Amino acid sequence: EQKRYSEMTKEELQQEIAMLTEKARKAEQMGMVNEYAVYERKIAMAKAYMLNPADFHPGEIYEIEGAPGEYFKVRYLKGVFAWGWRLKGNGEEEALPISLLRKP
């Protein structure tokens, strides 16, 4: 029965991502925009657990993966999350999976 992403090995995370990727693909062909975005969030989360939170630092600003020209300013890290805010948007704080920050 389903393991949480935080308990999976790399091999399990990769298999979960492959499965989610195929559903995301069909959702896209069918035009199920909301279902597609749900699968993409899960994929981002699974990817985050294959990255190193240490590569990210408070005060640093990063390009946002899947969104050219947009940047995120990191206030602080927690687990596989970076809390901070998008520059081009409102100063509202937001938690973003580290997989959505373009590596150094």
Residue numbers in the entry: 5 to 108
Question: What text does the study give?
Answer:
The crystal structure of a conserved hypothetical protein, GK0453, from Geobacillus kaustophilus has been determined to 2.2 Å resolution. The crystal belonged to space group P43212, with unit-cell parameters a = b = 75.69, c = 64.18 Å. The N-terminal region contains a helix–turn–helix motif (α1, Lys14–Met34; α2, Val37–Tyr53). The C-terminal domain possesses a β-­barrel-like structure with four β-strands (β1, Glu64–Ile68; β2, Ala71–Lys82; β3, Phe85–Arg90; β4, Glu98–Pro101). All other results from the search showed that the structural similarity occurred within the distinct domains of either the 44-amino-acid N-­terminal region or the 54-amino-acid C-terminal region. Hence, we speculated from this analysis that the N-­terminal region of GK0453 may be involved in a protein–protein or a protein–nucleic acid interaction. Since the functional tetramerization and the critical residues for enzymatic function are absent in GK0453, it is unlikely that GK0453 possesses an activity similar to that of DHFR. The domain bearing these residues, which are responsible for recognizing the methylated histone tail, is absent in GK0453; however, the GK0453 and MRG15 chromodomain structures both possess similar hydrophobic environments. However, the structural analysis suggested that the β-barrel domain of GK0453 may also be involved in protein–protein interactions with an unknown function.
As part of the RIKEN Structural Genomics Initiative (RSGI) project, in collaboration with UK Structural Genomics, we selected the hypothetical protein GK0453 (13 kDa, 113 residues) from Geo­bacillus kaustophilus HTA426 to predict its function from analysis of its crystal structure. The GK0453 protein is a member of the DUF1811 family in the Pfam database. In conclusion, the crystal structure of the hypothetical protein GK0453 revealed two small domains: a helix–turn–helix motif at the N-terminal region and an SH3-like β-barrel structure at the C-­terminal region. Based on structural comparisons, we speculate that the GK0453 protein may simultaneously interact with two proteins or with a protein and a nucleic acid to exert its unknown function.
